[PDB]
Amino acid sequence: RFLCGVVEGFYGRPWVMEQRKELFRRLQKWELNTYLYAPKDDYKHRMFWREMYSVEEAEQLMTLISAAREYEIEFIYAISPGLDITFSNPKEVSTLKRKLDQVSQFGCRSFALLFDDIDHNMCAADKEVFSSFAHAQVSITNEIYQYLGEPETFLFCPTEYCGTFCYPNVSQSPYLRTVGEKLLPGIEVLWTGPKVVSKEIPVESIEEVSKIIKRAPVIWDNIHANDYDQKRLFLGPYKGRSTELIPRLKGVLTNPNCEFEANYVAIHTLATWYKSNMNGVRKTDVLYSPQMALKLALTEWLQEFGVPDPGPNEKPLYTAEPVTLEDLQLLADLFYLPYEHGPKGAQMLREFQWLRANSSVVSVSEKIEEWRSRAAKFEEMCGLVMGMFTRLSNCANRTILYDMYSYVWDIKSIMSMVKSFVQWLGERSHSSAQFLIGDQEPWAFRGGLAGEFQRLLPIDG
Amino acid sequence: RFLCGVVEGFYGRPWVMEQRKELFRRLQKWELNTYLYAPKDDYKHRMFWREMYSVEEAEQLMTLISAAREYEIEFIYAISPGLDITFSNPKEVSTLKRKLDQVSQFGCRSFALLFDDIDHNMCAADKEVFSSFAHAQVSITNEIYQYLGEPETFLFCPTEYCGTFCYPNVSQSPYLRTVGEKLLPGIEVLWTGPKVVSKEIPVESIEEVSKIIKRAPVIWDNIHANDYDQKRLFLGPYKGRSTELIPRLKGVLTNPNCEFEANYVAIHTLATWYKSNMNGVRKTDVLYSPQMALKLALTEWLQEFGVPDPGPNEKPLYTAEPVTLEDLQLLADLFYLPYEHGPKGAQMLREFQWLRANSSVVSVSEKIEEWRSRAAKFEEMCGLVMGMFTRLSNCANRTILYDMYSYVWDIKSIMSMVKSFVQWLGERSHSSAQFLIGDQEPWAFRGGLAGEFQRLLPIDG
């Protein structure tokens, strides 16, 4: 059994019924199997873990759990008590049991305990009863695990849940030592790789962590997450993980973008990655191509954009220029991966800085010929980004469009300011006009009190 | 019978089941009665009005309609065919009937036809069969109205749906003349006032439009809408409409912010406005105070923010500094109304521009005393905005917080750049440091390709 699929475990707006049901559908049809319920901002999942779900809240989870059964997806309910739990207090342990009993009754059969993103410091009482932090955690986990009849799928998430989080390091951790020794063998351990958001999950570090936890980990992959508060979006393919990891892991769950529809690629490409070495035994990648996987994903995703007779003298059917595969390929390029822009977007950035760097060449002859030859192709590229923004804003699927609309609006806005600036640079040996940010539309014509103040900031001078 | 409540009729992400059910609950408990279903981006409502709803889409609308019945809210289903309908084609009229029949079968008993935001130009075929645009519309409306058994609640939305939209004007419109004459008397007419987003709906213009349409209109009020693409947010009270309008109107439906939870005030204050002259006969406001209505709203809304034993040596319960009424009063002030900032936010803006205007007074004696006395109180105000941002970002209710989080983040970001700038101005007669936008956090530490480009724009120089 290999757990593969999605963990809804980011900070931000939790997905709704409509979205989650749609996720289960897509997961089923791409042959994935797992959904881990972990919304950091489902108040009763973390913050107020003690509270029972209300009647309305209960009917919803039951429906949610039912749908997962209907689409053959295993629903794992996670709880995160580590913010304010007194481990040594028996009333606490009892409440944790009570909570997980409510969810069992809702129809859930697979559970997880999470101790991620909390501090190491125990309280006084706990420090008397427990040797270390790991000892407190493992004790309560094991107890819960056994109390629930030792379910087939039970997960544990460490506090030291990734390479950079282990004191003093991975292979010599007192915390991970305890976990790998004392935690019952029927329980899975979640791991994210070298870092929270791992650029690569090298096979070496998987063997390294495998040794100390004394089992194969389940990846909680944060490759596509965007909950870090400087809004980005990742539509690139699943990269950085060798298919050789598959036979060395108990599972891979991906914690994708907060915006739901922005996750087609992320989840699609993971399924392709998983299916490429589904059965393979234990032995850059010889089985999986991120470039070819992104293409397959975008090809199928395009079909999600499409539309669901009149006489020559009658009114023409509502229609607009269709979104093309090339449009999407450009979209993904511009909103690629956390550690890597796409080729064309990266190239546009180089070009813009070169043009601005060498703009003296046109201020007051062979460099002049190269500069213009480059500023031409740059404006021609800026034009394509606008082109595909417009086709995107016109498509039939409004749900997909509005999930990433603010991102698309931002880059569209910048490109035009950038295009104007290049034009204005290219015309200064025959123009006396001074460039100002306060002359544009996204800066000088911005709404709200926030904008009124922004215009008064020292822009240009 | 007075129709009062909400129209979901904006451009953007349509609300979901969870949100709409919550709306019905709140509407019921505030003694409102109506919900008009009009999402411009429900693809099968406008764009592809011909298409039947799918089985999945049907179960959802049935549930939605059922919930409205459960909370005693009248569900009105609207359709907008005016983008590509051939009025004269009998196959078209038949499809419009077929569509509205599906929805009737879902349990809906009240309907609306919308012809808002389309051009006046008919096609060739229609121009032969119909005298004018209004003639085409009224013909199809009347037909539908009668075919559905002349329902108790049927609405019509004009193309010339507001003052500024009538050629050549309101009282002398050929379009409105036809509508007021030919449109059956059992049908309501929607009106938004002098403009799309009316600052005021003067009693005079209501009598003016009443005469030509030959009936009392139902207001489709856009006071709180924010779908115009330069993101603002309106948490101010329902203002600009005299309670004298109530006995001169058949209804008021409000088309509020796209962000659902951002609409407590908007809908609350409307209920207060409506209840203040519920029964009153036909005779600045002597019955309703926007200031007192906003206070009542924020007072009750605060209760929506609240949280749903340990020994001295145990772990303290998770807690944080609570959101206060004064916090909300400040929040509403900063995100007030479309034509009006709140007092404190407006005052902060004046102060900032005065300080920047008179910053020479501290560049190289009595003005110096006034400037510092003012720059002090400004920084003290900037500090409060941060203060309440933080309390807000810490509250129990994550759904409310994340609905307006991007707005709150933007203003919070600007305030700090502004605070730094004032500080930097106040210290230049004893400092050699030059101010740069590219030194800050929201400009020089911004994520994504969009940011990389933004840093290369001519900021400061």
Ligand SMILES: CC(=O)Nc1ncc(CN2CCCCC2)s1
């Ligand atoms: C165990 C584990 O990985 N927990 C997580 N919670 C949320 C995540 C995504 N995001 C990454 C960037 C920083 C904020 C959080 S990762």
Ligand SMILES: CC(=O)Nc1ncc(CN2CCCCC2)s1
């Ligand atoms: C008849 C009527 O008012 N229709 C509407 N559709 C949407 C509305 C809100 N918003 C106002 C500002 C411009 C964009 C649209 S108003």
